Every structure is written in C-alpha cells, then in structure tokens.
Design a protein around this ligand. Structure first.
Ligand SMILES: [Zn+2]
Ligand SMILES: [Zn+2]
Lengths: 59, 763, 197, 105, 44, 146, 150, 67, 222, 41
C-alpha cells in the first residue's frame, strides 16, 4: 500500500544520496522529512526525480 | 671457505627473492595484473530491449593508476587509515564507449567504486621502502602483509583447501558403496558426478535431475563409439580375470534391445526434467546432446564424442580394479589428490558475481530511463555510473568484513573465510598467515582427515596444530614452498604432440593396455610405449626447453598410466638434481652465490634446484645428506629442517622431544606476550599485550635468524635450577623469586581501547 | 652410411583414412581377408563418411534381419565421424627412396546399422499416422513467427549442436574407384622432376 | 631395469624396422604411415649409422632421431583420393606398419 | 540465521528449557580462578 | 641392533628369493609384519633390560622407576637405551605413497628402517624419517584421545 | 594501559615444551646459591621431564650456559647445530662441570645439598593468562529477562 | 628496550655496561668474550643481558613525525 | 575390546560386528575329528568344488552340468553323499529361479533345468549356494587351550545349528551376543552373559571394578 | 557366450529358435550358425 510507495521513495532517495555523496544520517533525515511532507500531502503525480532532489536539497 | 658441506645458503636466497608470505601477495598481484583485466572481457556488451542502438563496451580496466597524474595523489596511508576507521582502498578506472549523438560516440573514462588492496602488493604504498618511507609512513617494516584494513579492523583471507577438481577419486564402503566419484567444472557447472554402484556390474550413472538410473553399456554405446566388443576389450582388459567379473551388465544392451539409432538417446534422457523452456527443446536429439556435453564433463566436444567416451572408459576401468584387486583405494587424503585455492581466486569469485549484480542493476536503470518521448540518453549514460558505484564498494567491503559470500551462480554459502588479525606476538602475526584451513571443520571422525599423512615431508608443518576440536584441520605450511599458478594447458598438450605421441583418433585396439598412456590432468592424449625415454626427454626439457616451468610428470605402475598435472593449487619445495655420480654443489656454484651474484631464479635456469611437491617425488628417490648417495638416484634434499614450520621453528632442539609436547608448544607459541612491531607505542589496538624488557633467545634456531625473531623476541631469559623445592613444585608448578621479579622480570603491558564515536542524529 | 631422401610434395589433400573397426589383423595368423571391395557415399562439410560393404551368403532370408518383420535387407553399412589430426604422412618405397605423401586427415568409423536406422522412426511415424490428435490447427498454420535477436534473455542453439544438426541437409553419392593406378602414383614422381631439392 | 628395457626393446625395434623396410616393398602395392611433428625449420638425407645405432633423421637441421610406434588393430588405410566436381577415387591400399618420429633434445 | 524459533527449539536440547536452563542452570554465589599448589593446608 | 637387522634382512630376503609360510594367520604380508614387530619388540625388551641392569646408583629415572613416580622403566629405556616400534592402528605405518612411504626409502619397502622403525634414542638425535614417524604416532594418539 | 606486575597465578612456560604456573614467591635467599653466589630465578619440576619425555631442555641448559660463558650465541636447530661433545669440553675448560651440574648450598640451613643441582638459562616466555584477566566473581546481581537467571 | 640498571638474579649494576660494550666493539675490537672479561664481568648471570637484549628503544625513537 | 564393545552390549543392538561362538568339542586334533567340526558348520566354497560350470546345446531346453571333485573332498570329508548336493540344489528358490529338476546321472553330470537370460542367471548364481552349514557363518579358527583341549571360535549368528551339531557338547558356548542369547536361552542366561561379557571386555585393560556394580548394571535392563 | 561376430561386430544372443530348431542368431545381423555345443569356459 503506502509502505510500498515509501519503499520506492527510500530506494530513490538512497540512489540520489549515494550519487550526490552525502552521509548516511542525512538520508534518514530526508526520509523523515519526505514522510512528514507526504503526511501533509505536498505533491502528487510527478516524475519524482525533481521531488526527491528537492527534498534532498532542503535536507 | 666451504668446499661442499654448506648446503644452507639456498634458503636465505629463496627468502630474499620470493619470501615467506607469498600465498597472498603473489596471488593478489597476479589477480590485479591478469584476471581483473581478463574477466571484464566476458561481460562488456550491455544491449537493451528498448531502443536497439545503445551499448557500452569495456576496452580497459585497471586499479589505482590514473594514467595522467600519479597513482592516486594520496592513496590513503595504511597506519593512518587504521586509526581513522576507514577502509584501505584504491579505486577502479575503466574506458568505455557510448552512443551519445546521432553520429557521435564518446570515449569518456570514468571510475566505478572503490576496492581494497592488501599490503605489500604491487598497487600499494609500502612496496620497496626502507626506513625512510617506512619512518614517514609510521608503520613497522617487518609485517608479513597479505591483509587489508576494512572498517578500522583488518582481515586476513585464509588459504582455503578443497579436494581436486579434474580427477577421479576412489571411495569405498561395506561391499556396496564402491562408488567411483568425481567432480568437474566448465567454470559454471559442478552439480554432481555420482558414479555409484547398486548391483554387481550395475554401476549406473546417477544425477539429481534424473529419475532412476542409466547403465554404462548404453552410455559407452550411445555417446561413445559402439562395437559391443570393445566394451569387453578396450575398457576392462585382455585377460579373462576381469572380463569374467565384467560379464554382468554387458548383455543389458541386448536385454532392453536399444542398439543405437536415436532411442539410445531417448532412453537415457526421457527421464530428465525441466527442458529449459516451453519449446520442448529435445527435438529427439538436443537435450541429449547438451546433457552429454555440458552438464557432466569439462569438454565441449563439438563434433567428436570420443574423448569423453575414453574418459568414462578409463573411469570405469578403476571400479573393476576396485572389485577384482581386493580393495585398493586412492583415498582423499593424499596431497596429489588435493588442490588449494588462494586469496586471489576467492576475491575473483567474489568480483565476478558482484560485477554481474552491478551490471544487471545498471541495465535496469538504462531501461528505466529509455521510456519517454524525450530526447535520447546522451549524458545520463555518461552519468549514472556513480549511482550504482556504491554496490561494488559496499558489497566488496561487507563480504570481507562479515565472511558470508552469497553468490547467485554457484549456489553456496561460505562461512568463516577471514579472521581478525591477532597480535599476541610476532609469531602470531606470522603463523596466522600461511594457514591451510579446510572443509571438514566440524565432524567427529577418527583417523580420517585428522591424522597426518607421510606426504608432508617439506610440504606442510608436521608439528603445527592447535589442540582441541580443530586438531588436524587448520595446520600450517612449511618454509621452502611455492604454489603453482596455471597459464594454459594447450601449448603443453601441443608440445606433448611434438614429443612423439599419437592421438585418440586412431588408437582403438586390444593394444590400448600396453605401456603407460599419457594424460593431461584428466584427459588422455595417447597410449604411448617407451615411457622412461619420454620422462627422460621431458626431464631434460624442464631444465633446457622453452615453456614448461610448472609441470609434474609421474608414472603410476599399478593403474598402468602416466599423468601430467598442470592445474594451479599444488605445493612445491626446492631440491637439488643429481646425475648418477655427484650433487650440484661443485665448489663453484655456492661460491658464486655467496660472493654476491647468481641468486635464486637463476639456479633453475642453470639446473641446480627445482621446486616441486606433487607425486613426481613418488616417482623419484631423494637422499638425506652428502654421504648417502647411491648411483641410481634422482634428487636429494637441501635442508632437513624445512619440514618444521615457522611457529615450530623457534623450538631449541625439537628432535630431542616426543611429538605431543612439540605439538602443544607449537600450538601455544603463538600465544605469549612480546614485542609485536616497531610502532608498538604509536598504535591503538583492541587487545595488545606487551613485553617490557624483551631479550634475545640465548640459543638461536637457524630459522629464527631468518624471520628476524632475534630482532623482535617474545619473552625473557632466566637462569633456572631444576630441583624439587619447598613442595610448591608438584605438577608444572613453578616458583619465582622476589627481588628478581622486582627488577623487571616478566613485566606486562595490557592495552585495551574504548572507542565511542559521537554521531549526530537525523533529528 | 646409407642416405635416404624425402621431400614434401603434396597438393591433393583429400585422402582421408578409414579405420575399419570390424576386421582383426591377420585373422588366424594367415593373410586371407582382402575385404576392401565396397562402395560409399559422402556428406560435405559435416564429416560423416558412411560406407556400405557387400554381403556374403552364410544364412539369410531370415525374417529378423531386415526388421522385426521386413524391409528386405541387402547390404551392410558402416559410418563414423572424426576430426582431422596434424602431423601424419604416408610413404612410397620406389625401389630406393621415400616420398612422404601427406595424410593429415583422419576419421575413425564404427559399424553403423543398415536398415534398423530408419525402422524405429518409421514405426513411430506409422503409429503417428491417421491419428485424430492433429485437429483443425493444421489448417491455420502460419509461418509468421519471426523472432527478434537474443537480447539478454536466453539464447538460440548457436553452434553447440551445428555438427549434430547438419546430418540430413545434404549428402553426396561418391562412386567406387576400381581402376585407379596412374593418377596418385606417377604424377607424384613427375612432381619430383620440378621439385629439384 | 628401465634402461635395460630401453636397450633391448630399442635393439629389437631397430632390427625389426630394418628388416621390414627392405622386404616386400620394391613393387607391390605396399605403403607406410609416417608421423612428423610440427615446427620444422626438406632434402631428407636420412642417414644410417652402423652397429645398431640407427641415426634416422635429416642432417641439415638438428638431429632428433627416434622411431618405433605402436602396432595397432583395425586396419586404417588411405585407400582413395577424391575431389569435388563429380569426382572418383584411386587405389592406394594396404597400410601395414606404423612409425612415428620421436624427437630427442 | 534463517530458522525461526517456536515452542520446539526452546525445548530441543543443549540450549533449551530441558538441557541447560532447567536441569543445569546458572547458579548464584560462585567464582572461578586458577589454582596454585600449597602443601601447608590440611585436606579439608 | 646389527644382528637384529641382519636377521630381518635374511627374514625378508628368504621371501624375496623364496617364500614364507605360516599356519594361524593369513597368507602373506601380515604374519610377516607381526614377526618383524615381535623380533623388534624383543630388541627393545633386551636392550632396556641391559640398560636397567647397567644403570647407575642414585640415578633419578631409576629412582622414579623403582618408586612409581612419573615414567616407568619403559620410559627410561626410551630415554637411554633405544626407541622402537611406534604403535599406529595396531601395526606399523601404512603406505603414504604408492608402494612405499617416504622418498628416502627404496621402492617395495619391506625392511626395518623402511616401514616405521625408529632406531635412535632421544639422546643420540633422531633421524628425520624417524622424527616424521614419531610425529605420525603422536598426532594419531592425540586425536584418538580427543 | 596498566603495567601489570607478574603476580602469583600467572602462567610461565618454557619455549621447549613444558608449561607452568607459579606456586609461591621466594624472598631473596631461601633459594640455593653457589660458589659465585648466583641465586637462580625460577625452579622447575624434575618430574616434568620423564613422563613428558623431554631431554632437549636438558641440553638447552648446557648450551645456554656455554653461550653465556664463551660469548657466542649458540645453535640448536633441527638435526644439526652445536653438539654436546665439544660443549662439555668448553664447560670443563672454563672450570665448570662437564654435565652442567654444580654443588649448591641450602637456603634454610646453610649446609650443602646431598645431590647435585644443575642450572643455566632458559628462554622463558609469559602467556596471556594473567590472573586478573581470569578471576571471576558472582553475587546477587543481574538476571536475564527470559528466565530470571544470571 | 633499555638495559636494566641491575641484573635480575644477582644484584650487580649494569650501568656503564652497555655503551662501554658497544664502544669497545666498534673501536678497539674484541671477539665477544674478552670484551666482557676486560669490562669486568665475572658471574655468568650478569652476562646474560649485555650478550642478550637487542636494542629496541633505538628503533622505537625512530618513529617521531618531526617531534 | 574397546569402548564400542561396551557401547554395543549396553544398548542390545540387533546386529553386531564380528562376534565369536566359542564352541567346545569332545575330541582333540587326533587325526580327523576336530577337522570335521572345522569343516562342517561354516561354509561350502562351491567355486572350488565345481572346478567349472559347463552346459552343452544339443536338445531343446538344455541342461547345465556340474562336476564334483572327489579327490579334493578326500581331504575334508563331510558330505561325500552327492545326492545331498542335489537336495541342497532342490532347496527351492535361493536365486529367484527354482532349480528343481536337477536329476543326476552317473559320473556326476547334474542336469540342471528367453532361455539364455535364465541360463546366465544360473551361470552367475550357482557359485554362491551352500551345501552344509548356516549361511550366517563366515569361517572358524581353532585354538589351543593351555590344558590340551581345543576350543574353536565361530564367526556367526546362529547358535542353534552349532549347538545341534553332533560332535560338540552343548555345555558351554561363550558368545558375544546379548539378544540372540536371550532368544535361544531365555532371560537368566542372557543376564549372566551381560554381567560376564562386560567383566571380560573390561578386565583385559586393567581397570577392574567391583562386579556387584556389573550385576546392578545387568539387573536394571533385564 | 561373449561372442565375437565378424561382418556385423555385435554380441550374439541365443534366444528361442522361432517355433522349430534351436538356432542362434544376432539382432538384425546375417552372421549366424546352428548349435554345435556352446564354447562355455
Ligand atoms: Zn647477573
Ligand atoms: Zn550380429
């Protein structure tokens, strides 16, 4: 359900995190930030590259 | 000066040229020089389903080179990397193409992940440094190497020992299990061999992907040459003492009435399952041909199915000799039936699967990108390699920091590969290396793979074994040793065709069982006569001729064959060649040696020493001393004390003891406190016991002079009165001396570290 | 003391040997066989070399010798495959010399079955004759099944059984020799007139 | 006694191959199957030394004498020579004795 | 480790609630130190 | 030891040129091994007997042997007199090779100092095949105990 | 790091093949001296030699005595090294006994020893079995969450 | 490391016994034993330290990165 | 004699590795009598008795000749009653093909019985049958007791036909079994065997204990 | 019998003689003989 979407988001955030050369704690910080943002229903239907890049950019 | 009685200065020259610990360094250097560049050519084409134009193509791969600048411009220093809790690594560099433009192909040269490199190798800092770079690098110039720091600690890849691969090993049981088993490898298929016997004469080929059984008289008549007379004549012998026992299971080709047209394939493979897809790919010949070729033998045999026929025909010639001859068995404890894998082969088998698990995910990313009406992928192919670059590094560090190597093509789980490096003493750091671990680790069997065999004179140490449950399984390895690597078996076989052999295209007769037939590690080439002249010619060619350099030949008279072993993994030891009158000292060779020229790796060119430990020496005769020669010999032994290992090499007069006390003392000699390294006061270790006032051994064994143990001792010297004093001297109960122990006798330094990394959270 | 010349002069190359795996060497220790009179037919570029040999009349007109019932057997056959070797040569012994004809081509043979080799497939096809299991799918048979090239999923046959596949595509009928004496004997000596060491 | 076995077996093989080479091969249809290894650097010039030491090789290149191959069953004859337009064959016939050249170093 | 533990591996043997947690249990008030000889004590 | 090796040399060469017979056991090469083991255990017994007969007063191995301390008179014979016939699997050492045991021994080894008979004491220094044989016996006894 | 003084209970083993744990510590002079007056450091068991069957340590004391006497670090490798025949000649040429023995004077009474006692240097290594690293205790302390046992 | 000030078993001081030994081995060379005999060594348990004891502190003081 | 012996007695295993049947005779090795007991009850090596196995093909459903060796069995005379060989063959199946019509003619030509497959089954099954003795007995070795009496041991499992055999007395049979001894002599003889054989296999290596512990070990499983 | 049959090179088997004389033959091979007594060793 929603956990599969957060798993896909965690894999994409893992990809952008290990590609952008950031440490491992800020990956979990961006993950909980994306979880809070999706709890606030901030965006839908994007290609998700811009979304994960923007969340990792603010984190 | 010496005339002929020295016989000793070959071992320091050997230790200076090659060295003691080379079971990891030489194998890893051969890996990063040949195999890391070779196995990438087998996986270079990454063609996709969508948009059938895109490809990469690997043309070059190398470790830590960066061929514009220097090697890394840091190549993070090893003792600093041990304290920083970093892995000691140097990255990968590759050269690849693209399909960037409509008419443009880029040749961008990128990197893919990091890779650990063991110390003292080619691609390291600590190669060829002597108290200046050693002093600036802040580490001891006496460590054995063969290890690499991963995640703060350092791990040592143990030398794994398994059985042989392309051989036919004999087994036995209580008159029912006369199974003539084997294994095989075409680098992706082992799965079985299971040549078991159920009824007398009935030695049906078993398999796991088959229902019941397949007879020999239909295998040798279907996928072998068919005559129904050579099965009495070619495979069993001429005299009736063997054929009268082999008379059963020769009428089975007449009982079921098979008589090969295509039903001799249909009956042997109507019982095999899972035919690879839903096409039903047999087409009354196909799965039978591929089951003959690839899943049961190491030869592809594209046109002539007769070499595998003669291989099975000589395999079944031993099980008849396991029945008529009252139970002679080549047991699976002899060293000639034993090949061991090194650190390079294990790290290659790791890398060849982790590269596949990288490439499949990268192809998945390519297929994820190419799925939109946007412009074609120019630069995201140039990019998006440092997004799965942390799959080779993280996996390559995890599999060496844990020790459980999951592979998706061989289907095994290997546990307990490495070990944390114990630094109780310098003897511990030398003897935990050069260790032969095994596969029979936890099994309570007496007098099996626990009792040592007489084929260990110079091969392995006969006194180095820790007492307990692992007694006879983790024994170490001797000093004068070398391990063969395999170049190629094809020029060797062609040179055998040059030296006067016939092939297996014209040799079917009753004269197959004349004088000894030549082999190449599990493949017969020809039943040649005049065996001593062939061995003499190759004896002259291994010293004078062009390319042999690692080949053991030996004539076995009981099974009436002669073999040639060329696979990699067997052990060696140097020995002096004699010719019927004298040795090869001759008053000038060792004189030129200790004058300051003509070192090792030149005495093989002239013909003095030649390192070997296979059953070549079983077809030989080795002398002990100078005053023991007989004019019928082959070789002699250089030093007699090369049988004891390095951990058994500090015992003063070991031959004046019984063997259990030597075994106990060599087991507990890598346990005492000492003077581990020169950076003793500049390192941080998790468990480090230190000696305060170390002193030399008063008596020196002639092996600890060479391993610099006199420089770095592991104890203390003391006079001692052997008497029964005060009743405190009952059963290994010593009594010390106040005001002698008060002056610094046996003072200890126990060092424990406590690292608490402070981390910032994701909050 | 005594010198023998030998010179390489081979430019014919089609002289494959045939290891007859039925006849012992000098049966009864008396040369009385002379069995080489036979016929043949070949196959190009697939290395089969089947040869049929004529019959002697010991006892046949027996029913079990053509099939289980009948094909009318009249000839024995023999066939065998084999890859060519490298290094062997023949020799001529022309009254004081040696000529060293190249052989270089070997294919061993075994006795191949003569009319059982179609009998088992013929009985299964006759049992598969007039069967109702091939229903109306035979009418709408289409050859539209063209497939793409093997993108990284599983591959084709691709050379592992090509020597096993090519055994029915073509076959040549090569006649007997029965009179050939001049051609591979005198032209070999004429080649020595232009060799001249 | 492997040196002795070498001595008497090579003497018997040399006497047999000298006796067989000079009988029944003037003009019958009688052949001989050689082998000669690869990498040859021919005039032939095959000399014969006396006292049983048959130095049977070429004396223009390095002398690597040796002979005495296996006598085998299952008669293997050349027996023909063909071509490919519609071609026919030849009488060759009757291979009897096997001989190789074992090089010495 | 991929067997799961249920109510049979807790009763199986040598680490379960029969053969190392019930019959032979870790008792209190003990101590473990190496031994040196001494003749001058009585045998009690 | 010289007359024992001479007697064993005739006892093996009367099978090399002739034949050997035995009533109770098997046909050959087991009663041969039993007779070699007996005629070499008699050597150990006699040389240990003359060793303890010759041995000194206030001799501390003899003091422990006459009192029952560490080591019997067999241990004192292994000290001074001779060591012989190590015991593995109730017989001598088997073939570690094809047809023999070590490269320092000739083929078809069926003599003493070819199939596992040490002849040197611990004082005189052991031979390297004898040291290997004693290592065989020591590791076999230790793993049997375990 | 702590500088552990080697206490009583600590393992001390010879390099030649005999183990050992100390029994008591002797003050200075209750151990028997000689004419030069050198008090030995450790005293080993004579019973540890026969049943463990070690005679090379008995050669090791002589080789160590001649090595510390004549100056040269002496041999003693496998199957060769410095023999005993010249070794006894060196020991009797300096003025010591030909067998490593010596007459000693008893500590608690001052008179001679009735039997001779031989003494010389042995390389003594200390093991990783300090009694502080092996002492154990238990009280009414922590218990498990699963069986309420320690 | 550093030679102890007094030997273990006996009590004779071992100061001015090491540098006066290496100074006597480099300059005014003696074989091995007349060095100790002229330096003043009598009891042979006072002679198992100057003859023994590889010098480790000269190899330990090498490791100072510009201290 | 070691710890597998005391391991195998105490659990009362149904099978056992190399037991002995110490049978006692009446007469000594005088000239024939003890060799008769040495030859009767063990095994008939019929591969030595036949000297070959031959048939001849003249009539339909041909017969397979067996030749006796009277001169060979004139050293170990047990069953020179050659109809007894025929009745041991008519011991019915023994090889899953009945050899019943084996009617012998003079000069020892036994006429035993597709066709060739059942012929070769009898060809490779005939040198396996026995004519006298239990098939569960390997061989026997005769020993010399110190008084002069001869005590032969038997490697076997029966203890009924070696006790039924005339020539030996059925007084004492010191065996190694603990379950077959129960099956042929009841409860108390088996428990005396289990308190005697433990004491025998343990006193041979010293370590002698009080045999009341042996009796208490024997009572608590019998 | 462990036959040696020339001109076909296969093992002979002595089956039933097809309702009549007890003959011996091979499987689809012309080499045969009538019985004259088997050559059993
Ligand atoms: Zn002192
Ligand atoms: Zn036939």
């Amino acid at each position: 359900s929603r956990e599969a979407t957060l798993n896909n988001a965690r894999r994409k955030l893992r990809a952008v995190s290990y590609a952008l050369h950031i440490p491992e704690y800020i990956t979990d910080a961006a993950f909980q930030w994306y979880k809070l943002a999706l709890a606030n229903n901030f965006v839908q239907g994007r290609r998700s590259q811009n979304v994960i890049a923007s969340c990792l950019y603010v984190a | 000066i010496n005339t002929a009685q020295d016989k000793w200065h070959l071992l320091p020259a050997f230790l200076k040229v090659k060295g003691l610990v080379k079971q990891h360094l030489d194998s890893f250097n051969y890996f990063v020089d040949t195999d890391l560049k070779k196995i990438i050519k087998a996986n270079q084409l990454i063609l996709s389903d969508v948009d059938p134009e895109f490809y990469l193509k690997y043309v070059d791969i190398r470790v830590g080179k960066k061929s514009s600048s220097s090697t890394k411009d840091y190549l993070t220093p090893p003792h600093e990397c041990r304290l920083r809790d970093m892995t000691y690594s140097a990255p990968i560099y590759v050269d690849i193409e693209y399909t960037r433009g409509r008419n443009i192909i880029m040749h961008k040269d990128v990197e893919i992940g990091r890779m650990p490199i063991m110390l003292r190798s080619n691609k390291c800092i600590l190669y060829d440094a002597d108290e200046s770079k050693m002093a600036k690098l802040n580490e001891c110039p006496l460590d054995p190497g063969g290890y690499f720091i991963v995640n703060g600690t350092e791990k040592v890849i143990l030398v794994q020992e398994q059985l042989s691969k392309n051989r036919i090993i004999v087994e036995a049981d209580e008159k029912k299990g006369i199974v003539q088993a084997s294994v095989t490898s075409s680098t992706h298929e082992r799965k079985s061999k299971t040549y078991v016997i159920t009824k007398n004469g009935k030695i049906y080929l078993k398999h796991n992907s088959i229902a019941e059984e397949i007879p020999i008289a239909i295998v040798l008549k279907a996928c072998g040459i068919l005559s129904d007379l050579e099965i009495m004549q070619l495979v069993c012998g001429n005299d009736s003492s063997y054929q009268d026992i082999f008379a059963v299971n020769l009428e089975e080709s007449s009982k079921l009435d098979i008589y090969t047209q295509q039903q001799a394939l249909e009956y042997i493979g109507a019982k095999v399952k899972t035919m690879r897809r839903q096409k039903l790919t047999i087409l009354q010949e196909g799965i039978e041909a591929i089951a003959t070729t690839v899943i049961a033998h190491l030869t592809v045999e594209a046109l002539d199915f007769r070499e595998k026929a003669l291989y099975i025909a000589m395999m079944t010639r031993r099980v008849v000799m396991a029945m008529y001859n009252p139970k002679m068995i080549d047991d699976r404890d002899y060293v000639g039936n034993k090949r061991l894998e090194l650190a390079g082969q294990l790290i290659s088998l790791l890398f060849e699967d982790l590269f596949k698990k990288f490439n499949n995910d990268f192809k998945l990313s390519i297929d994820k990108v190419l799925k939109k009406p946007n412009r074609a992928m120019e630069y995201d192919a140039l990019l998006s390699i440092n997004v799965h670059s942390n799959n080779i590094t993280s996996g390559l560090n995890r599999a060496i920091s844990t020790g459980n190597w999951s592979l998706k093509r061989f289907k095994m789980e290997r546990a307990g590969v490495t070990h944390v490096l114990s630094r109780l003493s310098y003897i511990s750091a030398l003897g935990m290396m050069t260790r032969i671990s095994s596969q029979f680790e936890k099994s309570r069997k007496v007098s099996g793979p626990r009792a040592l065999q007489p084929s260990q004179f110079g091969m392995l140490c006969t006194a180095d074994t820790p007492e307990g449950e692992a007694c006879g399984l983790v024994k170490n390895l001797a000093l004068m040793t070398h391990i063969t690597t395999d170049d190629e078996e094809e020029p060797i076989k062609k040179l055998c065709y040059v030296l006067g052999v016939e092939d297996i295209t014209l040799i079917d007769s009753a004269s197959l069982h004349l004088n000894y037939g030549v082999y190449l590690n599990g493949t017969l080439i020809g039943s040649i006569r005049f065996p001593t002249k062939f061995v003499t010619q190759f004896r002259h060619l291994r010293r004078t001729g062009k390319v042999s350099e690692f080949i053991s030949i030996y004539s076995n008279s009981h099974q009436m064959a002669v073999h040639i072993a060329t696979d990699g993994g067997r052990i060696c030891r140097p020995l002096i060649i004699v010719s019927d009158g004298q040795s090869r000292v001759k008053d000038i060779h060792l004189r030129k040696l200790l004058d300051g020229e003509l070192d090792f790796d030149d005495f093989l060119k002239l013909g003095l020493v030649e390192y070997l430990d296979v059953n070549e020496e079983n077809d030989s005769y080795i002398a002990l001393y100078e005053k023991d020669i007989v004019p019928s010999m082959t070789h002699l032994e250089i030093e007699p004390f090369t049988i004891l290992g390095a951990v058994a090499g500090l015992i003063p007069y070991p031959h004046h003891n019984q063997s259990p006390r030597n075994t106990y003392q060599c087991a507990m000699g890598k346990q005492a406190i000492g003077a581990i390294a020169y950076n003793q006061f500049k390192r941080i270790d998790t468990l480090l016991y230190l000696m305060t006032y170390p002193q030399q051994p008063m008596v020196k064994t002639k092996t600890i002079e060479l391993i610099d143990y006199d420089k770095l001792p592991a104890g203390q010297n003391a006079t001692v009165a052997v008497m029964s004093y005060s009743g405190y001297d009952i059963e290994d109960a010593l009594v010390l001396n106040k005001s002698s122990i008060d002056r610094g006798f046996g003072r200890c330094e126990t060092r424990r570290k406590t690292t608490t990394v402070l981390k910032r959270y994701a909050n | 003391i005594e010198e023998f010349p030998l010179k390489i002069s081979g430019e014919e190359e089609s002289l494959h040997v045939f290891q007859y795996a039925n006849r012992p060497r000098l049966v009864g220790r008396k040369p009385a066989e002379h069995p080489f009179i036979s016929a043949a037919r070949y196959k190009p570029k697939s290395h089969l070399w089947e040869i049929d040999i004529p019959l002697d009349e010991q006892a046949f007109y027996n029913k079990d010798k053509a099939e289980s019932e009948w094909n009318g057997v009249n000839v024995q056959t023999l066939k065998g495959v084999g890859v060519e070797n490298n290094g062997q040569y023949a020799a001529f012994v022309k009254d004081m010399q040696v000529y060293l004809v190249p052989i270089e081509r070997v294919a061993q043979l075994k006795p191949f079955f003569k009319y059982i080799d179609d009998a088992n497939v013929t009985r299964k096809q006759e049992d598969a004759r007039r069967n109702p299991n091939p229903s109306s799918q035979r009418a709408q048979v289409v050859t539209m099944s063209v497939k793409s090239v093997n993108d990284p999923s599983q591959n084709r046959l691709t050379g592992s059984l090509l020597a096993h596949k090519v055994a029915d595509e073509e076959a040549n009928i090569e006649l007997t020799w029965a009179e050939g004496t001049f051609e591979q004997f005198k032209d070999t000596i004429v080649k020595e007139a232009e060799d001249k060491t | 006694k492997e040196a002795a076995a070498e001595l008497e077996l090579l003497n018997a093989d040399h006497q047999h191959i000298l006796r067989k080479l000079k009988k029944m091969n003037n003009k019958p249809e009688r052949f001989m199957v050689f082998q000669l290894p690869t990498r040859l650097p021919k005039v032939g010039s095959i000399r014969v030394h006396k006292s049983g030491k048959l130095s049977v090789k070429i004396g223009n290149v390095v002398m690597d004498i040796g002979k005495g191959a296996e006598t085998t069953f299952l008669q293997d004859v050349i027996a023909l020579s063909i071509a490919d337009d519609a071609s026919s064959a030849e009488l060759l016939g009757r291979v009897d004795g096997k001989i190789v050249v074992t090089p010495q170093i | 480790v991929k067997p799961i533990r249920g109510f049979c591996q807790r009763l199986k043997g040598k680490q379960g609630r029969f053969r190392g947690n019930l019959s032979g249990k870790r008792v209190d008030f003990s101590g473990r130190t190496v031994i040196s000889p001494d003749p001058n004590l009585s045998i009690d | 030891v010289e007359i024992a090796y001479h007697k064993c040399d005739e006892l093996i060469t009367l099978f090399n040129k002739g034949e050997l017979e035995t009533q109770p056991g098997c046909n050959e090469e087991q009663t041969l091994e039993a007779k070699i083991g007996g005629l070499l255990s008699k050597v150990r017994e006699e040389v240990g007997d003359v060793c303890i007969n010759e041995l000194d007063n206030w001799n501390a191995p003899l003091i422990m042997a006459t009192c029952g301390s560490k080591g019997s008179t067999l241990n004192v014979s292994q000290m001074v007199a001779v060591v012989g016939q190590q015991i593995i699997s109730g017989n001598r050492v088997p073939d570690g090779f094809q047809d023999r045991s070590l490269p320092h021994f000739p083929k078809n080894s069926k003599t003493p100092q070819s199939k596992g008979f040490v002849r040197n004491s611990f004082f005189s220094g052991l031979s390297p095949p004898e040291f290997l044989f004693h290592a065989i016996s020591g590791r076999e006894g230790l793993v049997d105990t375990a | 790091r702590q500088n552990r003084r080697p206490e009583l209970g600590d393992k001390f083993s010879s390099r030649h093949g005999q183990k050992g744990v100390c029994g008591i510590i002797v003050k200075q002079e209750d151990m028997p001296f000689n004419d030069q007056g050198i008090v030995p450091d450790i005293i080993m068991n004579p019973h540890g030699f026969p049943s463990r069957m070690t005679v090379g340590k008995m050669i090791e004391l002589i080789s160590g005595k001649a090595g510390v006497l004549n100056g040269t670090l002496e041999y003693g490798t496998c199957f060769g090294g410095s023999k005993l025949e010249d070794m006894s000649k060196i020991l009797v040429d300096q003025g010591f006994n030909y067998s490593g023995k010596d007459m000693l004077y008893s500590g608690i009474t001052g008179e001679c020893l009735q039997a001779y006692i031989f003494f010389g240097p042995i390389y003594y290594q200390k093991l990783k079995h300090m009694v502080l690293d092996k002492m154990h205790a238990r009280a009414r302390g922590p218990r498990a969450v699963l069986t309420r046992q320690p | 490391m550093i030679v102890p000030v007094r030997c273990f078993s006996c009590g004779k001081v071992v100061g001015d016994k090491w540098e006066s030994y290496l100074n006597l081995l480099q300059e005014d060379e003696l074989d091995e034993g007349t060095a100790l005999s002229r330096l003043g060594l009598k009891r042979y348990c006072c002679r198992r330290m100057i003859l023994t004891h590889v010098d480790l502190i000269e190899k330990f003081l090498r490791y100072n990165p510009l201290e | 004699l070691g710890v597998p012996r005391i391991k195998e007695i105490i659990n009362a295993s149904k099978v056992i590795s190399t037991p002995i049947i110490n049978a006692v005779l009446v007469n000594d090795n005088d000239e024939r009598a003890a060799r008769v007991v040495k030859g009767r009850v063990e095994k008939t090596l019929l591969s030595d008795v036949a000297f070959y196995v031959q048939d001849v093909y003249k009539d339909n459903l041909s017969f397979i000749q067996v030749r006796i060796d009277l001169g060979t069995i004139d050293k170990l005379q047990l069953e020179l009653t050659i109809e007894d060989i025929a009745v041991a063959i008519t011991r019915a199946s023994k090889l899953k093909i009945q050899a019943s019509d084996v009617n012998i003619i003079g000069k020892d030509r036994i006429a035993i019985n597709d066709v060739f497959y059942r012929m070769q089954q009898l060809r490779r099954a005939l040198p396996d049958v026995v004519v006298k003795g239990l098939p569960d007995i390997s061989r026997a070795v005769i020993n010399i007791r110190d008084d002069g009496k001869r005590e032969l041991l038997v490697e076997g499992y029966g203890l009924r036909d070696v006790m039924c055999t005339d020539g030996v007395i059925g007084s004492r049979t010191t065996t190694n079994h603990v379950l077959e001894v129960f099956s042929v002599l009841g409860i108390e003889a088996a428990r005396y065997s289990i308190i005697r054989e433990i004491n025998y296999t343990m006193s041979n290596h010293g370590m002698s204990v009080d045999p009341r512990h042996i009796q208490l070990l024997g009572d608590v499983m019998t | 019998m462990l036959s040696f049959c020339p001109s076909c090179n296969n093992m002979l088997l002595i089956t039933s003689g097809d309702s009549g004389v007890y003959t011996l033959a091979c499987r689809s091979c012309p080499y045969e003989f009538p019985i004259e007594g088997i050559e059993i060793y």
